[PDB]
Amino acid sequence: ATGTGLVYVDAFTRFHCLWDASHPECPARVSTVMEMLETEGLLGRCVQVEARAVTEDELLLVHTKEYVELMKSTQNMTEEELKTLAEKYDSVYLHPGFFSSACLSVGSVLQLVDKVMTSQLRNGFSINRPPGHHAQADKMNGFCMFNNLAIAARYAQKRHRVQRVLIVDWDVHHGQGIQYIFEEDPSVLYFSVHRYEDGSFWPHLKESDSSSVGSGAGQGYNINLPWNKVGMESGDYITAFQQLLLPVAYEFQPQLVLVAAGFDAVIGDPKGGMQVSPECFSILTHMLKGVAQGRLVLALEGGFNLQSTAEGVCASMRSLLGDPCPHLPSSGAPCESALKSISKTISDLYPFWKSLQ
Ligand SMILES: CC(/C=C/C(=O)NO)=C\[C@@H](C)C(=O)c1ccc(N(C)C)cc1
Ligand SMILES: [K+]
Protein backbone atom coordinates (compact mmCIF):
# COMPACT_ATOMS: atom_id res chain seq x y z
CA ALA A 1 0.00 0.00 0.00
CA THR A 2 2.27 2.75 -1.30
CA GLY A 3 1.87 5.04 -4.28
CA THR A 4 -0.91 6.99 -5.98
CA GLY A 5 -2.12 5.60 -9.28
CA LEU A 6 -3.18 7.69 -12.25
CA VAL A 7 -4.93 6.49 -15.40
CA TYR A 8 -4.96 8.64 -18.51
CA VAL A 9 -5.14 7.53 -22.14
CA ASP A 10 -5.20 9.54 -25.35
CA ALA A 11 -8.51 7.87 -26.29
CA PHE A 12 -10.19 10.06 -23.64
CA THR A 13 -9.72 12.96 -26.09
CA ARG A 14 -10.94 11.18 -29.23
CA PHE A 15 -14.70 11.75 -29.02
CA HIS A 16 -16.48 15.10 -29.08
CA CYS A 17 -19.66 16.83 -30.17
CA LEU A 18 -19.77 16.64 -33.97
CA TRP A 19 -22.25 19.53 -34.35
CA ASP A 20 -20.79 21.99 -31.81
CA ALA A 21 -17.04 22.70 -31.69
CA SER A 22 -17.88 24.74 -28.56
CA HIS A 23 -19.49 21.98 -26.51
CA PRO A 24 -18.54 22.21 -22.80
CA GLU A 25 -18.00 18.45 -22.35
CA CYS A 26 -14.93 18.26 -24.53
CA PRO A 27 -11.47 16.68 -24.93
CA ALA A 28 -9.79 19.77 -23.44
CA ARG A 29 -11.29 18.89 -20.05
CA VAL A 30 -8.87 15.99 -19.58
CA SER A 31 -5.89 17.35 -21.54
CA THR A 32 -5.92 20.57 -19.48
CA VAL A 33 -5.94 18.47 -16.29
CA MET A 34 -2.96 16.45 -17.53
CA GLU A 35 -1.12 19.61 -18.58
CA MET A 36 -1.50 21.12 -15.10
CA LEU A 37 -0.59 17.90 -13.26
CA GLU A 38 2.64 17.91 -15.28
CA THR A 39 3.54 21.56 -14.71
CA GLU A 40 2.86 21.18 -10.97
CA GLY A 41 5.21 18.18 -10.84
CA LEU A 42 2.36 15.98 -9.61
CA LEU A 43 2.11 13.74 -12.69
CA GLY A 44 5.67 12.42 -12.34
CA ARG A 45 5.02 11.53 -8.69
CA CYS A 46 2.12 9.21 -9.58
CA VAL A 47 2.36 5.59 -10.67
CA GLN A 48 1.08 5.37 -14.24
CA VAL A 49 -1.59 2.66 -14.51
CA GLU A 50 -2.81 1.33 -17.84
CA ALA A 51 -6.43 1.63 -18.84
CA ARG A 52 -8.39 -1.35 -20.11
CA ALA A 53 -11.71 -1.85 -21.87
CA VAL A 54 -14.59 -2.88 -19.64
CA THR A 55 -16.08 -6.24 -20.61
CA GLU A 56 -19.71 -7.03 -21.33
CA ASP A 57 -20.01 -9.06 -18.13
CA GLU A 58 -18.65 -6.11 -16.14
CA LEU A 59 -21.10 -3.69 -17.78
CA LEU A 60 -23.93 -6.12 -17.02
CA LEU A 61 -23.29 -5.70 -13.29
CA VAL A 62 -25.20 -2.42 -13.67
CA HIS A 63 -26.62 -2.07 -17.18
CA THR A 64 -29.22 -4.12 -19.04
CA LYS A 65 -28.26 -6.38 -21.93
CA GLU A 66 -30.52 -4.43 -24.30
CA TYR A 67 -28.89 -1.10 -23.39
CA VAL A 68 -25.36 -2.53 -23.68
CA GLU A 69 -26.17 -3.91 -27.13
CA LEU A 70 -27.68 -0.59 -28.25
CA MET A 71 -24.67 1.38 -26.99
CA LYS A 72 -22.29 -1.09 -28.64
CA SER A 73 -24.16 -0.58 -31.91
CA THR A 74 -23.51 3.18 -31.86
CA GLN A 75 -19.92 2.63 -33.07
CA ASN A 76 -21.35 1.92 -36.55
CA MET A 77 -24.31 4.32 -36.69
CA THR A 78 -24.45 7.16 -39.17
CA GLU A 79 -24.30 10.70 -37.83
CA GLU A 80 -28.03 11.12 -38.44
CA GLU A 81 -28.74 7.90 -36.52
CA LEU A 82 -26.53 9.15 -33.68
CA LYS A 83 -28.42 12.45 -33.62
CA THR A 84 -31.78 10.66 -33.52
CA LEU A 85 -30.71 8.37 -30.66
CA ALA A 86 -29.11 11.16 -28.62
CA GLU A 87 -32.36 13.14 -28.76
CA LYS A 88 -34.02 10.26 -26.89
CA TYR A 89 -31.90 11.18 -23.84
CA ASP A 90 -31.50 14.22 -21.61
CA SER A 91 -28.35 16.33 -22.16
CA VAL A 92 -26.36 13.85 -24.27
CA TYR A 93 -24.40 13.93 -27.50
CA LEU A 94 -23.06 10.92 -29.37
CA HIS A 95 -20.03 10.21 -31.54
CA PRO A 96 -18.83 7.09 -33.39
CA GLY A 97 -15.98 6.68 -30.89
CA PHE A 98 -18.09 7.33 -27.79
CA PHE A 99 -18.68 3.65 -26.95
CA SER A 100 -14.98 2.74 -27.21
CA SER A 101 -13.88 5.67 -25.04
CA ALA A 102 -16.69 4.95 -22.58
CA CYS A 103 -15.43 1.38 -22.24
CA LEU A 104 -11.93 2.63 -21.44
CA SER A 105 -13.39 5.21 -19.08
CA VAL A 106 -15.05 2.47 -17.00
CA GLY A 107 -12.03 0.21 -17.27
CA SER A 108 -9.70 2.93 -16.00
CA VAL A 109 -11.54 2.85 -12.67
CA LEU A 110 -11.48 -0.95 -12.52
CA GLN A 111 -7.71 -0.92 -13.04
CA LEU A 112 -7.25 1.39 -10.06
CA VAL A 113 -9.64 -0.71 -7.96
CA ASP A 114 -7.45 -3.74 -8.71
CA LYS A 115 -4.26 -1.93 -7.68
CA VAL A 116 -5.79 -0.47 -4.52
CA MET A 117 -7.59 -3.58 -3.28
CA THR A 118 -4.47 -5.73 -3.77
CA SER A 119 -2.34 -3.16 -1.87
CA GLN A 120 -0.12 -2.38 -4.85
CA LEU A 121 -1.08 1.31 -4.50
CA ARG A 122 -2.57 3.32 -1.66
CA ASN A 123 -5.12 5.21 -3.77
CA GLY A 124 -5.64 6.52 -7.28
CA PHE A 125 -7.32 8.95 -9.65
CA SER A 126 -8.60 8.27 -13.15
CA ILE A 127 -8.51 11.33 -15.40
CA ASN A 128 -11.33 9.96 -17.49
CA ARG A 129 -14.11 10.96 -19.82
CA PRO A 130 -16.85 10.32 -20.60
CA PRO A 131 -18.19 10.85 -17.08
CA GLY A 132 -20.46 8.36 -15.40
CA HIS A 133 -22.59 9.49 -12.49
CA HIS A 134 -25.81 10.19 -14.48
CA ALA A 135 -25.76 6.99 -16.55
CA GLN A 136 -28.58 4.59 -15.71
CA ALA A 137 -29.25 0.89 -16.12
CA ASP A 138 -30.91 1.40 -19.50
CA LYS A 139 -30.23 4.97 -20.65
CA MET A 140 -27.63 7.66 -21.26
CA ASN A 141 -27.97 10.92 -19.39
CA GLY A 142 -26.01 14.05 -18.67
CA PHE A 143 -23.12 13.31 -21.05
CA CYS A 144 -22.68 9.82 -19.55
CA MET A 145 -23.04 6.43 -21.26
CA PHE A 146 -21.93 3.96 -18.57
CA ASN A 147 -21.92 4.46 -14.81
CA ASN A 148 -18.19 4.24 -14.17
CA LEU A 149 -18.35 4.21 -10.37
CA ALA A 150 -21.45 2.02 -10.05
CA ILE A 151 -19.76 -0.65 -12.16
CA ALA A 152 -16.55 -0.24 -10.17
CA ALA A 153 -18.43 -0.69 -6.89
CA ARG A 154 -20.08 -3.95 -7.94
CA TYR A 155 -16.83 -5.08 -9.55
CA ALA A 156 -14.96 -4.52 -6.29
CA GLN A 157 -17.59 -6.58 -4.48
CA LYS A 158 -17.55 -9.44 -7.00
CA ARG A 159 -13.85 -9.62 -7.88
CA HIS A 160 -12.23 -8.41 -4.65
CA ARG A 161 -14.82 -9.74 -2.20
CA VAL A 162 -15.55 -6.25 -0.85
CA GLN A 163 -18.65 -6.21 1.33
CA ARG A 164 -19.35 -2.48 1.62
CA VAL A 165 -18.56 0.37 -0.76
CA LEU A 166 -19.04 4.06 -0.04
CA ILE A 167 -19.59 6.37 -3.03
CA VAL A 168 -19.08 10.08 -2.33
CA ASP A 169 -20.32 12.42 -5.06
CA TRP A 170 -19.10 16.00 -4.61
CA ASP A 171 -19.87 17.08 -8.16
CA VAL A 172 -22.29 20.02 -8.05
CA HIS A 173 -24.94 17.86 -9.76
CA HIS A 174 -26.85 14.95 -8.28
CA GLY A 175 -25.61 11.57 -9.50
CA GLN A 176 -29.13 10.25 -9.93
CA GLY A 177 -27.83 7.29 -11.94
CA ILE A 178 -25.79 6.08 -8.97
CA GLN A 179 -28.79 6.64 -6.68
CA TYR A 180 -31.13 4.61 -8.91
CA ILE A 181 -28.68 1.73 -9.37
CA PHE A 182 -28.14 1.26 -5.63
CA GLU A 183 -31.53 2.44 -4.34
CA GLU A 184 -32.47 -0.98 -2.91
CA ASP A 185 -28.91 -2.03 -2.04
CA PRO A 186 -27.58 -1.60 1.53
CA SER A 187 -24.11 -2.81 0.53
CA VAL A 188 -23.34 0.41 -1.38
CA LEU A 189 -23.89 3.71 0.44
CA TYR A 190 -24.36 6.67 -1.91
CA PHE A 191 -23.81 10.21 -0.61
CA SER A 192 -24.33 13.20 -2.91
CA VAL A 193 -24.03 16.89 -2.08
CA HIS A 194 -25.44 18.98 -4.91
CA ARG A 195 -27.07 22.21 -5.91
CA TYR A 196 -30.83 21.64 -5.90
CA GLU A 197 -32.76 24.89 -5.35
CA ASP A 198 -36.00 23.06 -4.60
CA GLY A 199 -35.63 21.17 -7.87
CA SER A 200 -35.02 24.22 -10.05
CA PHE A 201 -31.43 23.16 -10.83
CA TRP A 202 -30.58 20.41 -13.31
CA PRO A 203 -31.46 17.49 -13.35
CA HIS A 204 -34.72 18.85 -11.87
CA LEU A 205 -35.75 15.74 -9.91
CA LYS A 206 -37.77 15.53 -6.71
CA GLU A 207 -35.71 12.37 -6.10
CA SER A 208 -32.65 14.58 -5.52
CA ASP A 209 -34.10 15.87 -2.24
CA SER A 210 -33.06 14.44 1.12
CA SER A 211 -36.38 12.60 1.48
CA SER A 212 -35.01 9.98 -0.96
CA VAL A 213 -33.25 7.70 1.53
CA GLY A 214 -33.38 4.47 -0.46
CA SER A 215 -36.02 1.78 -0.74
CA GLY A 216 -36.60 -1.60 0.83
CA ALA A 217 -33.45 -2.97 2.42
CA GLY A 218 -31.66 0.04 0.90
CA GLN A 219 -33.44 2.45 3.24
CA GLY A 220 -30.84 4.61 4.97
CA TYR A 221 -28.15 3.92 2.34
CA ASN A 222 -28.91 6.84 0.02
CA ILE A 223 -28.06 10.28 1.40
CA ASN A 224 -28.78 13.47 -0.58
CA LEU A 225 -27.61 16.86 0.72
CA PRO A 226 -29.37 19.48 -1.45
CA TRP A 227 -28.21 23.09 -1.45
CA ASN A 228 -31.09 25.53 -1.88
CA LYS A 229 -29.01 28.70 -2.30
CA VAL A 230 -26.05 29.43 -4.57
CA GLY A 231 -22.65 30.57 -3.32
CA MET A 232 -21.76 27.73 -0.94
CA GLU A 233 -18.15 27.80 0.21
CA SER A 234 -15.53 25.53 1.75
CA GLY A 235 -16.99 25.93 5.24
CA ASP A 236 -20.33 24.58 4.02
CA TYR A 237 -18.71 21.49 2.49
CA ILE A 238 -16.49 20.94 5.53
CA THR A 239 -19.56 21.13 7.79
CA ALA A 240 -21.45 18.68 5.57
CA PHE A 241 -18.58 16.22 5.85
CA GLN A 242 -18.11 16.65 9.64
CA GLN A 243 -21.73 16.49 10.79
CA LEU A 244 -23.16 14.11 8.20
CA LEU A 245 -20.93 12.18 5.78
CA LEU A 246 -18.03 11.17 8.00
CA PRO A 247 -20.15 10.05 11.00
CA VAL A 248 -22.16 7.83 8.65
CA ALA A 249 -19.00 6.64 6.89
CA TYR A 250 -17.37 5.55 10.15
CA GLU A 251 -20.57 3.76 11.21
CA PHE A 252 -20.90 2.08 7.79
CA GLN A 253 -17.26 0.89 7.80
CA PRO A 254 -16.71 0.71 4.02
CA GLN A 255 -13.81 -1.29 2.64
CA LEU A 256 -13.49 0.92 -0.45
CA VAL A 257 -14.35 4.58 -1.07
CA LEU A 258 -15.11 5.75 -4.62
CA VAL A 259 -15.41 9.48 -5.34
CA ALA A 260 -17.48 10.98 -8.14
CA ALA A 261 -14.90 13.74 -8.46
CA GLY A 262 -16.52 16.59 -10.34
CA PHE A 263 -15.22 20.11 -9.88
CA ASP A 264 -18.19 22.20 -10.97
CA ALA A 265 -18.68 23.46 -7.41
CA VAL A 266 -15.29 25.18 -7.65
CA ILE A 267 -15.06 28.95 -7.91
CA GLY A 268 -14.92 29.81 -11.59
CA ASP A 269 -17.19 27.12 -12.99
CA PRO A 270 -19.50 28.63 -15.65
CA LYS A 271 -22.73 27.08 -14.29
CA GLY A 272 -22.21 25.45 -10.88
CA GLY A 273 -22.98 28.64 -8.98
CA MET A 274 -20.85 27.72 -5.96
CA GLN A 275 -17.77 29.34 -4.45
CA VAL A 276 -15.67 26.40 -3.21
CA SER A 277 -11.93 26.99 -3.24
CA PRO A 278 -9.87 24.30 -4.99
CA GLU A 279 -8.01 23.91 -1.68
CA CYS A 280 -11.20 22.62 -0.07
CA PHE A 281 -10.88 19.48 -2.17
CA SER A 282 -7.51 18.79 -0.56
CA ILE A 283 -9.34 18.78 2.78
CA LEU A 284 -12.29 16.69 1.62
CA THR A 285 -9.91 14.15 0.09
CA HIS A 286 -7.89 14.12 3.31
CA MET A 287 -11.01 13.38 5.35
CA LEU A 288 -11.94 10.43 3.14
CA LYS A 289 -8.46 8.91 3.56
CA GLY A 290 -9.39 8.17 7.19
CA VAL A 291 -12.01 5.67 6.03
CA ALA A 292 -11.43 2.20 4.59
CA GLN A 293 -7.68 2.18 5.34
CA GLY A 294 -7.32 4.93 2.77
CA ARG A 295 -8.49 2.67 -0.06
CA LEU A 296 -9.74 5.58 -2.13
CA VAL A 297 -10.28 5.93 -5.88
CA LEU A 298 -11.35 9.22 -7.48
CA ALA A 299 -12.81 9.33 -11.00
CA LEU A 300 -13.45 12.52 -12.95
CA GLU A 301 -17.11 13.48 -13.38
CA GLY A 302 -18.07 17.08 -14.31
CA GLY A 303 -16.53 20.51 -14.01
CA PHE A 304 -16.57 22.63 -17.18
CA ASN A 305 -14.10 25.43 -16.38
CA LEU A 306 -10.93 23.88 -17.76
CA GLN A 307 -8.62 25.67 -15.31
CA SER A 308 -10.86 25.31 -12.25
CA THR A 309 -11.33 21.59 -12.92
CA ALA A 310 -7.57 21.19 -13.31
CA GLU A 311 -7.00 23.09 -10.05
CA GLY A 312 -9.53 20.88 -8.25
CA VAL A 313 -7.88 17.72 -9.58
CA CYS A 314 -4.44 18.98 -8.52
CA ALA A 315 -5.70 19.89 -5.05
CA SER A 316 -7.19 16.41 -4.65
CA MET A 317 -4.03 14.79 -6.02
CA ARG A 318 -1.82 16.61 -3.51
CA SER A 319 -3.81 14.96 -0.73
CA LEU A 320 -3.74 11.52 -2.37
CA LEU A 321 0.05 11.88 -2.58
CA GLY A 322 0.22 12.72 1.14
CA ASP A 323 1.32 16.35 0.88
CA PRO A 324 0.48 18.67 3.80
CA CYS A 325 -3.01 20.10 3.67
CA PRO A 326 -3.16 23.63 2.26
CA HIS A 327 -4.13 26.84 3.96
CA LEU A 328 -7.85 27.44 3.42
CA PRO A 329 -8.53 30.93 1.98
CA SER A 330 -12.18 31.05 3.13
CA SER A 331 -13.95 30.97 6.48
CA GLY A 332 -14.44 27.70 8.34
CA ALA A 333 -18.07 28.39 9.35
CA PRO A 334 -21.16 27.29 7.40
CA CYS A 335 -23.87 29.65 6.29
CA GLU A 336 -27.41 29.43 7.61
CA SER A 337 -28.79 27.91 4.41
CA ALA A 338 -26.17 25.14 4.48
CA LEU A 339 -26.97 24.43 8.13
CA LYS A 340 -30.66 24.22 7.21
CA SER A 341 -29.98 21.67 4.45
CA ILE A 342 -27.63 19.65 6.65
CA SER A 343 -30.14 19.60 9.52
CA LYS A 344 -32.93 18.47 7.19
CA THR A 345 -30.84 15.65 5.72
CA ILE A 346 -29.86 14.52 9.22
CA SER A 347 -33.52 14.58 10.21
CA ASP A 348 -34.38 12.39 7.22
CA LEU A 349 -31.56 9.90 7.97
CA TYR A 350 -31.80 9.89 11.81
CA PRO A 351 -33.73 6.56 12.13
CA PHE A 352 -30.99 4.69 10.23
CA TRP A 353 -27.72 5.94 11.75
CA LYS A 354 -26.97 5.94 15.47
CA SER A 355 -24.19 8.49 14.95
CA LEU A 356 -26.75 11.08 13.78
CA GLN A 357 -28.74 10.97 17.02
C1 LIG B 1 -25.80 17.86 -17.97
C2 LIG B 1 -24.98 19.07 -17.61
C3 LIG B 1 -23.91 18.90 -16.62
C4 LIG B 1 -23.54 17.70 -16.16
C5 LIG B 1 -22.49 17.59 -15.13
O1 LIG B 1 -21.65 18.43 -14.86
N1 LIG B 1 -22.60 16.43 -14.41
O2 LIG B 1 -21.72 16.25 -13.42
C6 LIG B 1 -25.21 20.29 -18.11
C7 LIG B 1 -26.29 20.57 -19.11
C8 LIG B 1 -27.57 20.98 -18.38
C9 LIG B 1 -25.82 21.67 -20.03
O3 LIG B 1 -25.30 22.67 -19.57
C10 LIG B 1 -26.01 21.52 -21.47
C11 LIG B 1 -25.22 22.33 -22.29
C12 LIG B 1 -25.32 22.28 -23.66
C13 LIG B 1 -26.25 21.40 -24.25
N2 LIG B 1 -26.38 21.37 -25.63
C14 LIG B 1 -25.30 21.85 -26.49
C15 LIG B 1 -27.61 20.92 -26.29
C16 LIG B 1 -27.07 20.59 -23.42
C17 LIG B 1 -26.94 20.66 -22.05
K1 LIG C 1 -23.11 15.42 -6.24
Ligand SMILES: [K+]
Ligand atom coordinates in the same frame (compact mmCIF):
# COMPACT_ATOMS: atom_id res chain seq x y z
K1 LIG D 1 -27.68 2.38 -1.65
Ligand SMILES: [Zn+2]
Ligand atom coordinates in the same frame (compact mmCIF):
# COMPACT_ATOMS: atom_id res chain seq x y z
ZN1 LIG E 1 -21.61 18.14 -12.57
